[PDB]
Design a protein around this nucleic acid. Structure first.
Ligand code: ZN
Lengths: 99, 48, 287, 161
DNA sequence: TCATATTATTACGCCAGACAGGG
DNA sequence: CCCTGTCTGGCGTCCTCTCACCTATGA
């Protein structure tokens, strides 16, 4: 089975990507597993915002890396190859893995 | 009447339409002669 | 539409221009199903698709893209009679002189290289050696050599010395045969002699020497290097009433030439001794 | 001193020609006139020529040509046929009948950048693998996908060197 | 089933055409 | 060197009809 790991910072974008991937899968092949949402990584950062000194002065940023696990149960000849053509939205790292 | 295949299909259409006319063409067995002589080391052609 | 029919010799460039693909494997067909062989005598890419406007294996089952050739099929996409006009070529490993120009009575290569038919066949069937521009030794150009004549010469003239055999040697002789030069010589020889027999023997040799210069026929086109194969449609493989294929005789001939040529390429590619290969090239010559 | 010679057999019956040749030697007991006999036969190069350590008497020549399924020697002439070299047959000796073919242990998974994936979605496909996760049994073969060079976690058994 | 590759009979009748032999 | 037996190749009627018979091998 083809496991697909979508990773992105924007959630909407990721969602869009996932849908597209599903569409790509579903026309060619059959029995797409589904878009399973894994836990989001909220990598936080604190920094001092003064140039020199004021320690209680701080900004707390974060990067929300979202995960989408799409799986394809039956890899046909038409389906797997299709991925190459269908171009998705930018800033979405995909990670397909057969078996 | 014998050999040329496009010639005889043109002939059959022309006979069932009343025309009575032949488009001659070439015997296909002469092309077979060209392929059998040409399949040796001999280079037979058709000039002009 | 067209005037006169012109006949001439077939150059290896001319035979490669006729062709549409090298016929390698001798395997005719599958014989247990219906499909042919990829890529054997009855190929797909070299010639054409059995079915009209169809990839025999699987793509294009309508009338839109006539021509596409996928990697899964290695097939052209045209008419059912397209294979009847298309011909293949067999890359003969070892050079083989034509039998029509070696045994026509009089032989074309017999009265051109000033050598007796008997001696021409000896060297041609790997039974005699022939010298070719030896050098500073005591030997002629047309004069042949035997095993004993070569062995002694081998230990004698080990340096500048050339003495090959077979069609290869013959080809060289023909290739290195200044036609024009011979004309004057022959013409001068005919005007400087009174011998009746010689006169007729010289006028028949100079007639075929000046006629070759008048046309675009080369002396090295006598030996077959790029053997041409007749179209499958013209060597048809139909089964009779039953379950077996009544095969033509030309398929036996082409399949043997290709079997022997594959054997000769494999023996030449294994870096084996230089003599081994005389029987192999002789069997290819006879094939 | 025994020098080498080349024998031509019916190609395909070469091991049986070699066995019959050894047996004709031990029948007509010219044991001092034959050293060895190289006749390979794979499930095969050279599958058509038999190398014989020999000397040249006309009796031993008639012996080798009276061995069945043997055409004759290959040389300059048929009166005094030709020896070649010891190195020529030397190569054959090494792989005369040594355990060869149908055996690919650790020499059938070479990473480099030449492999084909078949035990998965990549139907009849190949790609270049830059990095590899042997420890966790993973491969980063970058198969030409989506108009680029995106890698895909494949299985060692799933791919083929 | 899928590659492997060629040997133990003679008994036509001219008629040209090329070839080694010899006065 | 000009006759000469001797050997080798190359011909041998068109049209039609009926029937039967078709490579061995093999770990
Ligand atoms: Zn196709």
């Amino acid at each position: 089975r083809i496991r697909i790991r979508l990773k992105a910072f924007d959630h909407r974008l990721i969602d869009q990507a996932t849908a597209e991937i599903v569409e790509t899968a579903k026309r060619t092949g059959a029995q797409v597993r589904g878009p399973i949402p894994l836990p989001t990584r909220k990598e936080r950062f604190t920094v001092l915002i003064s140039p020199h000194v004021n320690k209680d002065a701080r900004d707390q940023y974060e990067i929300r890396t979202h995960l989408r696990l799409v799986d394809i149960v039956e890899p046909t000849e038409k389906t797997v190859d299709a991925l190459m053509r269908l171009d998705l939205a930018a800033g979405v790292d995909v990670q397909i893995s057969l078996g | 009447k014998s050999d040329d295949v496009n010639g005889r299909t043109k002939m059959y259409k022309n006979i069932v339409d009343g025309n009575h006319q032949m488009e001659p063409g070439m015997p296909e067995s002469f092309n077979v002669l060209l392929k059998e002589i040409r399949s040796l080391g001999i280079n037979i052609e058709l000039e002009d | 539409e067209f005037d006169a029919i012109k006949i001439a010799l077939a150059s290896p460039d001319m035979i490669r221009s006729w062709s549409f693909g090298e016929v390698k494997k001798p395997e005719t067909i599958n014989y247990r199903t219906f499909k042919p062989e990829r890529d054997g005598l009855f190929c797909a890419r070299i010639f054409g698709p059995v079915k009209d406007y169809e990839c025999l294996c699987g793509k294009y089952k309508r009338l839109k893209h006539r021509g596409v050739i996928c990697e899964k099929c290695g097939v052209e996409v045209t008419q059912t009679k397209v294979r009847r006009e298309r011909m293949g070529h067999i890359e003969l490993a070892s050079p083989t002189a034509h039998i029509w120009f070696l045994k026509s009575l009089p032989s074309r290569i017999g009265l051109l290289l000033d050598m007796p038919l008997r001696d021409i066949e000896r060297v041609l069937y790997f039974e005699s050696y022939v010298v070719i521009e030896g050098g500073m030794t005591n030997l002629e150009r047309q004069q042949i050599l035997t095993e004993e004549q070569y062995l002694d010469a081998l230990e004698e003239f080990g340096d500048e010395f050339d003495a090959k055999m077979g069609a290869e040697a013959i080809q060289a002789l023909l290739k290195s045969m200044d036609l024009e030069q011979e004309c004057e010589q022959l013409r001068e020889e005919l005007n400087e002699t009174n011998s009746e027999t010689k006169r007729k023997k010289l006028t028949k040799r100079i007639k075929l020497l000046e006629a070759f210069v008048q046309s675009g026929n080369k002396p090295e086109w006598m030996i077959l290097t790029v053997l041409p194969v007749l179209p499958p449609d013209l060597r048809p493989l139909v089964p009779l009433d039953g379950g077996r294929f009544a095969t033509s005789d030309l398929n036996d001939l082409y399949r043997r030439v290709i079997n022997r040529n594959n054997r000769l390429k494999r023996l030449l590619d294994l870096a084996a001794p230089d003599i081994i290969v005389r029987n192999e090239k002789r069997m290819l010559q006879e094939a | 001193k025994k020098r080498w010679y080349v024998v031509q057999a019916f190609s395909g019956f070469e091991g049986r020609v070699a066995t019959s040749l050894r047996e004709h030697i031990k029948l007509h007991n010219m044991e001092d006139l034959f050293g060895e006999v190289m006749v390979p036969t794979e499930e095969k190069f050279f599958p058509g020529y038999v190398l014989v350590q020999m000397v040249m008497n006309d009796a031993s020549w008639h012996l080798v040509r009276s061995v069945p399924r043997v055409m004759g020697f290959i040389g300059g002439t048929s009166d005094r046929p030709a020896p070649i070299s010891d190195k020529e047959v030397d190569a054959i000796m090494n792989r005369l009948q040594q355990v060869g073919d149908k055996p690919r242990p650790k020499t059938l998974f070479e990473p480099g950048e030449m492999v084909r994936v078949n035990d998965g979605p990549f139907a009849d496909f190949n790609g270049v693998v830059e990095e590899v996760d042997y420890e966790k049994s993973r491969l980063k073969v970058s198969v030409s996908i989506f108009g680029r060079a995106t890698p895909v976690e494949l299985d060692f058994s799933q791919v083929e060197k």
